[PDB]
Structure formats: C-alpha cells, structure tokens
Design a protein around this ligand. Structure first.
Ligand SMILES: *[C@@H]1O[C@H](CO)[C@@H](O)[C@H](O)[C@H]1NC(C)=O
Ligand SMILES: *[C@@H]1O[C@H](CO)[C@@H](O)[C@H](O)[C@H]1NC(C)=O
Ligand SMILES: *[C@@H]1O[C@H](CO)[C@@H](O)[C@H](O)[C@H]1NC(C)=O
Ligand SMILES: *[C@@H]1O[C@H](CO)[C@@H](O)[C@H](O)[C@H]1NC(C)=O
Ligand SMILES: *[C@@H]1O[C@H](CO)[C@@H](O)[C@H](O)[C@H]1NC(C)=O
Length: 206
C-alpha cells in the first residue's frame, strides 16, 4: 500500500441548471489505488473571481456544485487521495455552470437578392458574452405571404435553416418569384434560442 498512482482523467464541469455545475471524472482503475479504498479531492473556484478554493472530498466520481451564477467558468482540480497520501498535484481544467437562454438578437449586415428564387441573408456574429452559453449555431426562420390558410397543425409552414455558429451567412433557395417573405434570425446554445430579429424582403418577377 502507498499513495495513489495517478489522478483521474476526463474531468468535466457542466450543469443541468443555471444554478449548478456538475463536475465529473473517470473513476480510477483499482490497480492505480494502492489501497483498498480511494477518495477524490475536488477543489474548485470561479474563473474571474479567484478567491479561495472551495474544496470537498467525496468517494463518488461526481460532485454537484450548487448556488452558482448562470453560465460562468470555474477552475477545477481532481486529485485522488487514500490513507497513504495524495496523488500528484492535479492538472487544472475549466468547466461552466448551467446554460441559459440567449440575450443576443442578431444584427443584419445585408440581404442580397440573387434570383427570383434565392437570396443570401448575411448577419453579424453575436457578442458571445450575451449568449450565456456555448454558441452552437444560428437559426433562420422564413415564411411566405400566407394567402391560403385551410390547415392548422402545419398551416403556412414556417421553414427554417440551421447553420453552425461560425457561418454568418446562408443562401435560401426554393423561393417563389414575386412574393413577400418574413424572416427571423436567432442565436441558440444548448438551452434554447434567443429573441428573433425581424426582417422582410421581396423576390423579383422571374
Ligand atoms: C442534475 O444532475 C444531477 C446529477 O449530478 C441530478 O442529481 C439532478 O437531479 C439533475 N437535475 C436535473 C434538473 O436534471
Ligand atoms: C451563494 O452564492 C452567492 C454568490 O453567488 C454568495 O454571495 C452567497 O453567500 C452564497 N450563499 C451560500 C449559502 O453559499
Ligand atoms: C438561384 O440562385 C442560386 C444562388 O445560389 C443558384 O443556386 C440557382 O442556380 C439560381 N436559380 C436560377 C433559376 O437562376
Ligand atoms: C429555432 O431553432 C430551434 C432549435 O434549434 C427550433 O425551435 C426551431 O427549429 C427554430 N425556430 C423556429 C421558429 O423554427
Ligand atoms: C466557433 O468559433 C469559436 C471562435 O471563433 C470557437 O471557439 C468555436 O469552437 C467554434 N465552434 C465550433 C463548433 O468549433
């Protein structure tokens, strides 16, 4: 019997609620314990504030951190410990509290009319500090004038395009010539989508 051989890997820090941050790691292989029982030394503090480290020694491979702010980064260290001592100093990982709906509305750059049937919608990248999460993509919902209206579960179908978070334009084809479209653009993360910006445009006679 001796100190633990290695510290855990696969440290992660992600909450399911904007008031918590679940921390997790990979339980150590028993060959790495060097004793018949092993605990995990878990130190954490926000990144930015850098006060004292909060600390807690639990035996399960996870620790629920509560009473947090919405989506804020924490420094995280996990260190195996037993009767004989501690493992090497842990390596520092970063992890965030829960995600929340986005505050950023997307600002227009220009809407370029290509055909009687296609248009290139170009918005600006959103301020990440307003996303309150990991920016996952952008959400572009467009619909036609809407003249007929005889159905419900699927009336005047509002089509939409999903693009990654690092493309700041999209082409929208398949349009009807000489029509009026509305248009909404949203950022989204894991939680949800932010408020939509509103725009209209018109297709040529074709
Ligand atoms: C969040 O995850 C923890 C497990 O770490 C669980 O106990 C809790 O019930 C979860 N809450 C929600 C709302 O999913
Ligand atoms: C909860 O968190 C706030 C800061 O986020 C802190 O000021 C307050 O004292 C905390 N309370 C407890 C019981 O941890
Ligand atoms: C409409 O414009 C798009 C631009 O991407 C192009 O793919 C398509 O060929 C055009 N259609 C016609 C009929 O010009
Ligand atoms: C916005 O995207 C979300 C998920 O990405 C989903 O509710 C939907 O596809 C989009 N919104 C609309 C109104 O289509
Ligand atoms: C999008 O770009 C940012 C920085 O510009 C980057 O950190 C992020 O990982 C990118 N998204 C994906 C899915 O790789």
């Amino acid at each position: 019997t001796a100190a633990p051989e290695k510290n855990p890997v696969d440290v992660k820090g992600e909450g399911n609620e904007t008031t918590n941050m679940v921390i997790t790691w990979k339980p150590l292989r028993w060959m790495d314990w060097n004793a018949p029982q092993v605990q995990y030394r878990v130190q954490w503090r926000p990144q930015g504030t850098r006060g004292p480290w909060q600390e807690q020694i639990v035996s399960d491979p996870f620790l629920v951190v509560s009473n947090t702010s919405t989506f804020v980064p924490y420094e995280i260290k996990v260190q195996a410990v037993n009767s004989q001592g501690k493992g090497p100093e842990p390596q520092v990982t970063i992890g965030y509290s829960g995600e929340d709906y986005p505050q950023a509305i997307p600002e227009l750059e220009g809407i370029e009319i290509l055909n009687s049937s296609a248009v290139l919608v170009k918005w600006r990248p959103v301020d990440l500090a307003q996303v309150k999460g990991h920016l996952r993509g952008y959400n572009v919902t467009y619909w036609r004038e809407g003249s007929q209206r005889k159905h419900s579960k699927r009336h005047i179908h509002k089509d939409h395009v999903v693009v990654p978070a690092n493309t700041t334009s999209v082409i929208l084809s398949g349009l009807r010539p000489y029509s009026s479209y509305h248009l909404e653009v949203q950022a989204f993360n894991g939680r949800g989508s932010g408020p939509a910006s509103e725009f209209t445009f018109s297709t040529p006679e074709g």
